[PDB]
Amino acid sequence: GDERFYAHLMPTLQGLLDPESAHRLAVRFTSLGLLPRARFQDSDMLEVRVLGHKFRNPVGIAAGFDKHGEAVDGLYKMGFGFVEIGSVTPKPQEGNPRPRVFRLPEDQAVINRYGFNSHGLSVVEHRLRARQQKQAKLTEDGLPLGVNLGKNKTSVDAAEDYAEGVRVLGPLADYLVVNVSSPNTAGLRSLQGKAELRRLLTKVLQERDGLRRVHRPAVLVKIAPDLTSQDKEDIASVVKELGIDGLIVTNTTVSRPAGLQGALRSETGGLSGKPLRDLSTQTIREMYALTQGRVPIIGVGGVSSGQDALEKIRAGASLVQLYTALTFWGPPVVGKVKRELEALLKEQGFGGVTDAIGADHRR
Numbered sequence: 001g002d003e004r005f006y007a008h009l010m011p012t013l014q015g016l017l018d019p020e021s022a023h024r025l026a027v028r029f030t031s032l033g034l035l036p037r038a039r040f041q042d043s044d045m046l047e048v049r050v051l052g053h054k055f056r057n058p059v060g061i062a063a064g065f066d067k068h069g070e071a072v073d074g075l076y077k078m079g080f081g082f083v084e085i086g087s088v089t090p091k092p093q094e095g096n097p098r099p100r101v102f103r104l105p106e107d108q109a110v111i112n113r114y115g116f117n118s119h120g121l122s123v124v125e126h127r128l129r130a131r132q133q134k135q136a137k138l139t140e141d142g143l144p145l146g147v148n149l150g151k152n153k154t155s156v157d158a159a160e161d162y163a164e165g166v167r168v169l170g171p172l173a174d175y176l177v178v179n180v181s182s183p184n185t186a187g188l189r190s191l192q193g194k195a196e197l198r199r200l201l202t203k204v205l206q207e208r209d210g211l212r213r214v215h216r217p218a219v220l221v222k223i224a225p226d227l228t229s230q231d232k233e234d235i236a237s238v239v240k241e242l243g244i245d246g247l248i249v250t251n252t253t254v255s256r257p258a259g260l261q262g263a264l265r266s267e268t269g270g271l272s273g274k275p276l277r278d279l280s281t282q283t284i285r286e287m288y289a290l291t292q293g294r295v296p297i298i299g300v301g302g303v304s305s306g307q308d309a310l311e312k313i314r315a316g317a318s319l320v321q322l323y324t325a326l327t328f329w330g331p332p333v334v335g336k337v338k339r340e341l342e343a344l345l346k347e348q349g350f351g352g353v354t355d356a357i358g359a360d361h362r363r
């Protein structure tokens with residue numbers, strides 16, 4: 001439970017296991033509840049009301065750690081204020097050949113090209129149904145569940161893949177994410193283009209609206225950090241035109257920022273962690289401005305401290321997520337981020353997280 005011991009423990013495990021093996025093991029341990037339950041108790045300062053729900057704290061686990069919905073309860077126990085699973089594809093698929101995940105310890109970064117390895121909708125559906133009422137109580141308790149939807153590699157109709165995801169997992173989710181920003185599926189990111197995006201999201205929203213009221217999720221779009229100014233303007237325009245409920249900003253980057261030191265920096269894939277942090281923050285800042293602060297943003301990318309979280313909140317994020325920091329600092333990082341965030345909010349005169357959202361734009 002000690003942040004300092006994990007930040008001896010983690011260096012040792014990483015020296016024993018390749019990152020995918022470590023990941024699979026972490027999912028197993030988490031799902032089994034082997035893990036101190038977090039000591040940090042959330043104060044009222046951290047509560048956020050957005051997307052039609054209460055979040056007891058603004059720090060969630062990003063998509064990709066629990067791709068198949070196996071460790072949801074263990075993740076709440078870790079102290080996350082909300083959990084997002086996925087991406088899930090309609091049919092099962094294996095993803096790319098291994099190795100497909102790489103550590104850049106000198107950069108506190110990871111590169112991955114998993115390629116949407118997924119148990120598929122049916123498996124995940126039954127897995128979530130088995131704990132559906134437990135989740136209903138968690139959500140009511142301020143601990144919401146998100147489901148992130150992807151598309152199969154060999155799919156002929158991308159929009160239909162997402163539509164299927166809405167119909168099958170929408171009823172089980174507090175929010176859905178249309179993931180159009182994975183760098184690891186050919187042609188996927190072009191769905192971020194204005195015409196493709198409008199057509200895709202119109203279909204997604206129609207399917208969502210066709211679900212019964214108590215089973216009707218918010219719909220968010222998750223975007224890349226690598227968008228042109230034109231891409232961002234167009235996404236903002238479509239989001240407001242269609243009434244999209246929120247944005248997740250951002251996925252991993254295909255860029256390789258000057259200064260990366262890791263030996264594996266030239267591996268193909270999406271880069272996450274520290275080198276992504278400010279690129280993500282600036283994308284949040286831009287999208288918040290383009291949407292006039294009217295569209296909830298979940299900020300993601302390189303968060304490993306309370307300062308990192310608050311910078312994204314002040315840039316316009318209502319909630320934040322992290323993943324990569326977990327691989328370097330381990331479970332203690334969740335409470336660390338929350339404790340540091342609370343201290344910083346007090347220091348800077350905010351009554352709570354809600355007061356800080358978008359604060360940079362009012363200065």
Ligand SMILES: Cc1cc2nc3c(=O)[nH]c(=O)nc-3n(C[C@H](O)[C@H](O)[C@H](O)COP(=O)(O)O)c2cc1C
Binds near residue numbers: 063086250321324
């Ligand atoms: C190993 C790995 C797998 C990921 N898988 C997904 C995914 O399946 N769907 C998705 O929307 N994002 C996925 N992501 C992106 C993360 O959700 C997040 O947007 C990105 O890693 C930036 O946050 P971070 O720096 O805290 O890790 C993945 C990231 C990593 C490191």
Ligand SMILES: CN(Cc1cccnc1)c1ccc(NC(=O)C2CC2)c(C(=O)O)c1
Binds near residue numbers: 018020029101110330
């Ligand atoms: C040890 N740990 C944190 C943890 C989380 C939940 C329960 N116990 C411990 C963890 C989890 C996932 C990891 N791998 C990855 O996720 C990589 C990106 C594929 C790593 C790693 O690569 O070193 C370490």
Ligand SMILES: CCCCCCCCCCC[N+](C)(C)[O-]
Binds near residue numbers: 023024027067117120
């Ligand atoms: C039929 C299912 C095909 C996809 C298998 C996916 C296995 C996922 C194992 C845990 C997640 N991880 C990313 C670490 O592989």
Ligand SMILES: O=C1C[C@@H](C(=O)O)NC(=O)N1
Binds near residue numbers: 064115181
């Ligand atoms: O959305 C995604 C998909 C994931 C993968 O390759 O499965 N890799 C990522 O970095 N982001």
